[PDB]
Amino acid sequence: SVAHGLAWSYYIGYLRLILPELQARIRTYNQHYNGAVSQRLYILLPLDCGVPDNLSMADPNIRFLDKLPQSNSIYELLENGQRAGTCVLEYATPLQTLFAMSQYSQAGFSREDRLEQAKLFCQTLEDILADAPESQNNCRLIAYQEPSFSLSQEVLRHLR
Amino acid sequence: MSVAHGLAWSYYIGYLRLILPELQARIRTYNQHYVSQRLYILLPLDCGVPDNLSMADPNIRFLDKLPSNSIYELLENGQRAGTCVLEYATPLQTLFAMSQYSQAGFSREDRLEQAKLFCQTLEDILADAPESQNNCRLIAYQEPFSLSQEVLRHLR
Ligand SMILES: CC(C)(C)c1ccc(N2C(=O)c3ccccc3[C@H](C(=O)O)[C@H]2c2ccc3c(c2)OCCO3)cc1Cl
Ligand SMILES: CC(C)(C)c1ccc(N2C(=O)c3ccccc3[C@H](C(=O)O)[C@H]2c2ccc3c(c2)OCCO3)cc1Cl
């Protein structure tokens, strides 16, 4: 099960390092500018493992606002043309290993196997975050399957 | 639940699969401009990856960047014994960091078992990728030591 290794590397090599300092970085950015960024990192977990080049390409209601200094991005979520939210948002990039594996014929890794590992990656990550207090309170995982679909709506639901 | 299977598949599919088919042309270009046609990957079974590769041995001196891979001159008794593209298997840093994170309940004995599994799984992956296995060499080692001598043995 490749998902156990992917979830442990994602946490130990990245989330464990950025989440304890994210609250101070968002507080600094909010103090700098008089509009306010929500205090957590929203992680997009598309269960299809499709990670685009730019997050803004997935929905025209997700506009790039700015980079959070000290590389994370802030986005404004739109609902009917109005600014419905502002947050630090990004994809769970280790999902790209599962997508690439599903296209590499020699791996013998089907789209059914890919969905099973994408789900296992999300479950293993939430098991890891359960034991890390400063990390579970500084991030929110947004797991989704596409059925017609609005990613900004999916994010907005979690924000509220 | 072994982390090594995920670490070896990501190392190959997200990095080696992309750089190894174009490495032979990059080394031939560099040689024409101004050696050794393979990527030598250091796999310390202790999972210790230093900040700079040159800190692990004074007989491993940085030569240049391959137009990010590094070229190094290996020394034996002060003389240039070899020139190759060398780098560590960076996913081993997950295993080392896991072994220092209390909540993981991942011992140094568990870490050695996963470092070995990572090399075995990566060799199994490279066996099925022809253009990748011909353009890369895995140097797995346990420190009891000369890293330059360990690399030089594989070069020959
Ligand atoms: C080719 C594409 C589609 C563009 C792609 C892009 C990124 C990834 N990665 C992952 O899945 C990943 C899985 C676990 C931990 C960290 C990561 C990285 C990440 O999350 O960015 C990254 C990655 C993989 C291997 C590496 C590496 C970085 O650094 C050098 C050594 O080997 C994979 C693919 Cl397939
Ligand atoms: C803190 C230190 C000691 C400095 C550290 C440094 C590097 C790693 N990585 C790995 O072990 C690794 C494992 C499998 C595939 C790719 C990699 C990367 C690599 O090989 O460089 C890298 C990594 C991990 C997670 C990531 C990521 C990159 O990109 C963003 C999303 O999550 C781990 C640690 Cl613990």
Side-chain angles (χ1 to χ4, degrees), chain A residues 2-20 22-26 28-30 32-39 41-52 55-56 58-62 64-75 77-79 81 84-110 112-115 117-122 124-125 127-133 135-136 138-160, chain B residues 2-21 23 25-27 29-31 33-36 38-50 53-54 56-64 66-78 80-108 110-112 114-119 121-130 132-142 144-156:
Chain A
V2 286
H4 283 115
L6 293 172
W8 270 108
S9 55
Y10 192 42
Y11 174 73
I12 228 107
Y14 179 71
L15 298 175
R16 187 182 57 91
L17 316 169
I18 73 153
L19 297 178
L22 178 76
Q23 193 172 118
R25 288 170 66 209
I26 290 170
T28 295
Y29 185 92
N30 284 342
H32 191 6
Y33 302 109
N34 306 330
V37 177
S38 303
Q39 273 296 356
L41 172 66
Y42 290 75
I43 302 177
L44 298 175
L45 294 134
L47 293 176
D48 74 355
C49 305
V51 178
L55 163 44
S56 298
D59 195 326
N61 297 340
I62 307 177
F64 173 86
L65 208 135
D66 209 348
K67 289 274 184 304
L68 185 64
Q70 174 162 311
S71 179
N72 309 86
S73 300
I74 310 167
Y75 297 90
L77 304 164
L78 311 173
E79 186 166 7
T86 306
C87 64
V88 180
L89 187 74
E90 63 180 50
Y91 282 91
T93 50
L95 290 175
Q96 290 169 105
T97 282
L98 300 178
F99 186 76
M101 277 177 73
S102 79
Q103 311 189 101
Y104 179 51
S105 62
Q106 280 301 318
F109 187 80
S110 70
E112 302 91 59
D113 291 348
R114 185 195 59 196
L115 184 58
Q117 297 300 296
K119 279 166 178 175
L120 179 60
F121 171 85
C122 194
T124 304
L125 192 56
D127 288 336
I128 289 173
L129 300 168
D131 286 351
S135 267
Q136 186 160 78
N138 280 204
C139 89
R140 290 299 184 267
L141 303 168
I142 307 167
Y144 54 95
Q145 273 213 77
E146 278 193 28
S148 77
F149 185 75
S150 175
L151 181 60
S152 59
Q153 281 310 300
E154 184 86 18
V155 178
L156 280 169
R157 175 200 312 141
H158 286 269
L159 257 301
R160 306 157 173 169
Chain B
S2 86
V3 285
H5 283 116
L7 293 173
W9 270 108
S10 55
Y11 191 43
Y12 173 73
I13 225 133
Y15 178 70
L16 298 175
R17 186 182 57 90
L18 316 171
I19 72 154
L20 297 177
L23 177 75
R26 289 169 66 210
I27 293 170
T29 294
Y30 185 92
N31 283 343
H33 188 190
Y34 300 108
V35 316
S36 305
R38 291 164 190 91
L39 169 61
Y40 291 75
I41 303 177
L42 298 175
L43 295 134
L45 293 176
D46 75 355
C47 306
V49 178
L53 191 136
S54 297
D57 206 319
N59 302 304
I60 307 178
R61 264 146 55 167
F62 182 86
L63 208 137
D64 208 346
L66 185 64
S68 176
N69 309 86
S70 299
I71 310 164
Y72 295 93
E73 46 155 3
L74 305 167
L75 311 172
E76 184 173 354
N77 295 171
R80 186 157 83 164
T83 307
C84 64
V85 176
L86 188 74
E87 64 180 55
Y88 281 92
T90 50
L92 291 174
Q93 291 169 104
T94 282
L95 300 178
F96 186 76
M98 276 178 74
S99 78
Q100 313 214 291
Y101 178 53
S102 69
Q103 271 103 337
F106 186 81
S107 70
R108 304 210 189 100
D110 290 347
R111 185 195 60 196
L112 184 59
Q114 297 300 297
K116 279 166 179 177
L117 180 60
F118 171 86
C119 304
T121 304
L122 188 54
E123 278 172 27
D124 290 336
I125 288 174
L126 295 170
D128 286 352
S132 281
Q133 185 164 78
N134 206 108
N135 282 196
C136 91
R137 291 300 185 267
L138 304 165
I139 307 167
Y141 55 94
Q142 274 215 241
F145 183 75
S146 193
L147 181 61
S148 58
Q149 279 306 299
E150 183 86 18
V151 179
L152 275 171
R153 175 159 49 80
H154 287 268
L155 257 302
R156 306 157 171 165

